[model samples]
Target: ARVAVLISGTGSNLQALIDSTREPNSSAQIDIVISNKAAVAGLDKAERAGIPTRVINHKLYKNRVEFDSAIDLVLEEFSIDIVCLAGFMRILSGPFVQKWNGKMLNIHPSLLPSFKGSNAHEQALETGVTVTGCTVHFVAEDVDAGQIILQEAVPVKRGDTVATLSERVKLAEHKIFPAALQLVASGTVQLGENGKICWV
Candidate 1:
């Protein structure tokens, strides 16, 4: 399967996906990378890996729908089979979400259904939770409420700051993002009825 990775930042997770596809039996190949922000390190990573990259700057578009439509056209141009959100910051429009509904995946910084939205690491630390981690899920219109595909727990230490906790969760994200993508791309897992995860 050909995959398109959407990124907004450094793209450590994007690097992981790139590496994973180099393995002998990877089910997906990252064909292109797109960024909503211009000149991000993620785009550089993709270019260095010989994958095509594009920038669909959200600021240029008047609304989410327009921005997402631009992205949709790019995905179509690439004949993408899967979409991976690696640190992608924009909130996709509902129409965009519905169009890509079972085909898109996102990795969040916290064990979802707990700390959702931005500043998730801060939310976990503020709530004083002892354990928090990352989740890879299907991209639903309701944000992080999508059906979970994989999760790994990371312990929050007594003196943990947002930076420390986030770094730890990011490592976990790098590990699981590729694994979850493999599951989805190989058709071993799916967004089933009622948005449930159906594992084959």
Candidate 2:
């Protein structure tokens, strides 16, 4: 399967996917990397991997539809089969979300439905939770509320700062995001008629 990774920062998850594809019998290949901002470290990472990259700078577009449309054109141009949102900061419009639907995946820093949106690590820390983790899920219209594909728990240790907890969760993200993509790409998972994750 051909994959396109979207990012807006240092793409540790993207790097993980790249590494995974290097292994024997990998299920997918990252063919392109798209960023909503220019000059992000993720773009450089993609370049270093010899994958094609594009910058559709959201700031250039006046609205979400326009920005997402630009991204869609690029996706179509590349004949992308799967999309992985690896720290892509832009909120996709509903139409765009529906267009990709089951083919899109995202990795959240926290076990979603608990701490969503931005600063998830901070939210976990503030809530005084004993455990926090990362979730890889299919992208749905409702922010981080997508049907989960995989999750890995990390214990919240005492004296753990937001940075410390986030680092741990990110490490987990690197593991599951690629594994989730493998599941979807290899037809081991799918979005069922009931809108739940179906394992094959």
Candidate 3:
């Protein structure tokens, strides 16, 4: 199935997906890359890969509804099958999330339902946890509140700070992000009638 990757910053996770689908036999092709921010390295990554890219700056919109409406137009135009939220900063509107329903995915820096939000790595450090990791899951309307599809645990070392821990978690993110997407693309996993994701 076709895919769209939404990104915000320098997208290492996005780069991972790009590498995964680069194979000749890979079923999931990134049809487009969407970003709510402009002049980001993520766009450069997509452009270098020759995938189409769009910037739907939320700043230009008057409200969330207006912002997502523009996003809807682009997704509809490309007929995206799976929406991958890489480093995308916007918390999507409920209506936009509902429209995609079971077809969207997100990669978080923490092994959620633990740490969520942008400060997840710092949150992990503040708690002084020995172990923390990453999660790839079905994106729901509530931020990072979704059924887990996959997770990878990264050890928190004695001297770990937010930057150091985040860099390590990012490595795990690069690994599992593509793996979770492959599960959906290959029919090995799916969103069930129970409104939760389940493996086939």
Candidate 4:
């Protein structure tokens, strides 16, 4: 399956997907990388992997539709089968979300329904929770409110700052994001009845 990974910053998850596709019998291939900001490290990762890259600055568009229209054009050009939001910071508009509804996926740093929006790691720290983790889910119109594809828990350690905890959570993100993508690519998972992800 062809994939277009979207990012706004360092593309650690993108790198993970790239690495996974190198293994034998991998079903997913990242054909292109798209970023909202130019000159990001994620672009470098994509370039190093020999994948095509594009920049579509959200600020350039007057509204979300215009911005996503540009993105849709690119995805159609590439015949993208899946949209993976690695660290793409923009919240997609409802129409855009519906356009790729079942085809889109996103990875969140904190276990969602808890630490959402910016500063997810900081929010998890402030909540005084014993456990926090990463979540990979389908992208819905509502922010971070999608059906979970996979989640792995990480214990919150004493004296762990946002940096330390984030480091730990990211490790899990790398593991599960590609795993979830593989599930979709391999025909092992799908958006089934009631829009829930189902094992095939």
TM-score of every candidate: 0.98, 0.98, 0.97, 0.97
Better of 3 and 4 by TM-score: 4
Q: Model 4 compared with the native: what TM-score?
A: 0.97
TM-score of 1: 0.98
Candidate 4: C-alpha RMSD after superposition: 0.9
Candidate 2: 10-residue stretch with minimal lDDT: 162-171
Q: List candidate 1 segments past 4 Å from native.
A: none
lDDT of 3 by residue, 128-181 (tens): 999999999898988899889999999999999888998898989989999899
State the displacement of the C-alpha of residue 64, model 4, in Å, after optimal TM-score superposition.
Answer: 1.0
- In model 3, pairs of residues that clash are none
Candidate rank order under lDDT: 1, 2, 4, 3
Per-residue lDDT of 137 in model 4: 93
lDDT of 2 by residue, 86-117 (tens): 99999999999999999999999888788988
Q: Show model 3 residue runs off by greater than 4 Å.
A: none
RMSD of 3: 1.0
lDDT of 4 by residue, 30-63 (tens): 9989999989999999999999999999999999
What CA root-mean-square deviation does each model show from the true structure?
0.8, 0.8, 1.0, 0.9
Please give the range of 10 consecutive residues that has the lowest summed lDDT in model 4. Answer: 191-200
Cα lDDT of all candidates, in order?
A: 0.93, 0.92, 0.90, 0.92
Which residue pairs in model 2 clash with each other? none
Q: Report the lDDT tens digits of candidate 1 across residue range 147-184.
A: 99999999999999998898888889989999999999
